[PDB]
């Protein structure tokens, strides 16, 4: 029950083995990424294992999507029937139609949370990564320092717990 081997991990191991459907496993992954990844995750309860769990989960979805899609689909269709390129161009669209860094970052993180392989084919995903990621930076790094920490903390919406500076 430590760093690399623990009940929590063992739990999901057994929990994942029960997935006999691409749809189920695919959805679970989605819900897992919504519940345990990124700063916007729903909870930090699995902070010490979610990364290792998520992979054991991408695995199942990987194997299943394999023994389910046909070549053309495995290369162009998400494990959700979604048309990879469609979603891609669809997201880059909203990204470039973003008013500010706050809007931008919200799209990118959601994109990764929803279509991270084995959901979307890696080819499209990383192509998105280079497009979305680029835009995100452009907005963020523009007058990166202009805002004062006080204000920035407010914009980020953090809850200042303690401050000390001599």
């Amino acid at each position: 029950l430590g760093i690399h081997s623990n009940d929590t991990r063992d739990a999901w191991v057994n929990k994942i083995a029960q997935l006999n459907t691409l749809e189920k496993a695919a959805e679970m992954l989605k819900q897992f990424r919504m519940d345990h990844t990124t700063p916007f995750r729903n909870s930090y309860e699995l902070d010490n294992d979610y990364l290792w769990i998520e992979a054991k989960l991408e695995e199942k979805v990987a194997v299943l999507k394999a023994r389910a899609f046909n070549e053309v689909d495995f290369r162009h269709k998400t494990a959700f029937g979604e048309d990879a390129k469609s979603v891609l161009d669809g997201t880059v669209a909203k990204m470039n139609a973003a008013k500010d860094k706050w809007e931008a970052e919200k799209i990118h993180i959601g994109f990764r949370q929803a279509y991270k392989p084995p959901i979307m084919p890696v080819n499209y995903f990383l192509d998105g990564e280079r497009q979305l990621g680029t835009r995100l930076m452009e907005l963020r790094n523009l007058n990166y320092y202009d805002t004062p920490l006080e204000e920035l903390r407010k914009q980020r919406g953090v809850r200042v717990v303690h401050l000390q500076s001599p």
Partner: protein
């Protein structure tokens, strides 16, 4: 029928034309900059001339190592403290060199000019060479040294300690995660130009002073390759200088790059040098000021000034926090000695005198603490005392900066003592400076690195060590030690008897 041939230069002359145009002939990586496809590289080399000049270097290096140095028992006649220090220096530089392999591969993909790609390619191969060279140093000291433990398994025993995390930030993730240009700065523009290059030479000086002729033989060779890494970095700023984004994002990326690197190396390097040796070469203070302020933040950055490159706005901050950084950190590294993969020693009388002479005030603070820990038996397994306990007793929390991963103790530090805590979506975050805080506030998803106190929460100390293999071949004695002598070595049991259980320091604010 005169004997004739063609050299690399005569071929490279056509290398630029090797690349052609076509729809998606562009980078696969996110970047706010546009690398000019008309950019040239400095050295007109082809794969074959590259291999040759490197093979020649290899001959001398390995020749010295396998022959004369071995005959002179060079892997043994080095001071114990330094034998330990190299477990960290060599292996930590290894990952830095290794990640640099991916970073330059990424840069190579970023460049559109045939020559700029070729230039980065040379480094890809250089960084692989450097990974293997640093690996060889630990390999050699493991094979022929006074204490193989750590040298022989650093790749996995490194993961037990907190110092390793920060290394992955400056020389791993900071090398490949983010804008290719941002990664380029962390690597070549700031990392290598400001620290690595000078560091590499310095390491050879401290090594020689302590009887280590192994490291100079390897690092000086690595050093010869640096001239190209510098070339690549300078070319990065050139290939994007004429881009409108440059005047819009360069500096920010540079300042952030500068702070990122100095945040870790400022404390760590000075620590390794001054505390991981017996004989000293020069006070880390005069060294840092020369490297950072003079050379880099002046002579080097100044030359890029004609491209809009400005001095890091955090330079004032960095210097003000640097003075005691390394001294402040060793207290933490020693207090947490059981989590390492190397053995540490407390300053001896000459050293304490050396420290006080060079850093007035050192003894009244650090010196007295070390004498207290020692008199109390921090070196003796039978004392039942580990300095971490003293921090708990005197209510001196130790935090891990969520961004740079550098351990810090505001309540005790003679250096920076600012502490900023924030809660966000059910998770607490601790920061040690304003630059790192801003980096987090703006890019929350770029920094979610779990700290040791978070991963080891509630875990008993000897269990973490055992699980991560922090033991010697006898399965009982720890790799890490609070002294560098040959007797009275701490065993896993000695640690278990302590019943030290980790706690997430941030929760005290709940």
């Amino acid at each position: 029928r005169a004997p004739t041939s063609v050299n690399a230069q005569e071929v490279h002359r056509w290398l630029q034309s090797f690349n052609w145009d076509f729809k998606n002939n562009r980078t696969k990586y996110a970047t706010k900059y546009k690398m000019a496809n008309e950019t040239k590289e400095q050295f007109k080399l082809i794969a074959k001339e590259y291999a040759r000049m490197e093979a020649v270097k290899d001959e001398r290096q390995f020749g010295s190592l396998q022959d004369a140095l071995t005959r002179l028992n060079a892997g043994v006649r080095v001071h114990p403290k330094w034998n330990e220090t190299m477990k960290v220096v060599s292996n930590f530089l290894e990952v830095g060199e290794y990640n640099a392999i991916a970073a330059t591969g990424m840069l190579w993909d970023s460049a559109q000019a045939a020559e700029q790609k070729n230039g980065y390619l040379a480094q890809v191969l250089d960084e692989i060479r450097h990974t293997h060279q640093c690996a060889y140093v630990n390999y050699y000291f493991a094979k022929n040294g006074q204490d193989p433990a750590g040298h022989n398994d650093a790749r996995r025993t490194r993961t037990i300690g907190p110092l390793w995390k920060g290394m992955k930030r400056v020389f791993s993730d900071g090398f490949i995660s983010g804008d290719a240009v941002e990664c380029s700065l962390n690597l070549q523009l700031v990392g290598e130009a400001c620290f690595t290059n000078p560091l590499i030479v310095a390491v050879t000086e401290w090594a020689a002073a302590n009887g280590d002729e192994i490291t100079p033989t390897v690092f000086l060779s690595i050093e010869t390759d640096e001239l190209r890494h510098m070339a690549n970095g300078y070319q990065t700023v050139v290939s994007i200088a004429n881009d409108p984004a440059s005047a819009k994002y360069l500096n920010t990326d540079l300042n952030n790059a500068f702070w990122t690197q100095q945040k870790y190396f400022t404390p760590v390097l000075g620590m390794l040098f001054e505390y991981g040796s017996k004989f000293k070469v020069e006070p880390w203070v005069k060294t840092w000021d020369r490297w950072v302020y003079e050379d880099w933040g002046g002579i080097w950055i100044g030359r890029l000034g004609k491209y809009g490159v400005e001095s890091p706005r955090s330079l004032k901050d960095a210097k003000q926090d640097a003075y005691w950084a390394h001294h402040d950190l060793y207290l933490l590294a020693y207090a947490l000695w059981p989590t390492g993969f190397f053995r540490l020693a407390l300053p001896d009388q000459e050293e304490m005198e050396w420290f006080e002479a060079n850093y007035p005030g050192w003894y009244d603070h650090y010196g007295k603490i070390y004498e207290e820990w020692r008199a109390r038996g921090c070196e003796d397994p039978s004392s039942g005392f580990i300095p971490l306990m003293w921090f708990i007793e005197n209510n001196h929390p130790i935090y891990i900066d969520r961004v740079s991963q550098v351990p810090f103790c505001p309540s005790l530090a003679k250096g920076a003592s600012t502490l900023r805590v924030h809660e966000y979506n059910g998770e607490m975050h601790t920061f040690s400076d304003q630059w790192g805080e801003r980096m987090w506030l703006a890019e929350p998803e770029r920094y979610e690195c779990q700290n040791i106190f978070e991963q080891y929460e509630g875990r008993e100390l000897s269990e973490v060590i055992a699980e991560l293999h922090g033991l010697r071949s006898d399965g009982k004695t720890l790799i890490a030690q609070p002294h560098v002598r040959g007797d009275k070595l701490w065993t896993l049991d000695d640690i278990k008897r302590l019943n030290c259980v980790f706690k997430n320091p941030v929760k005290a604010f709940n």
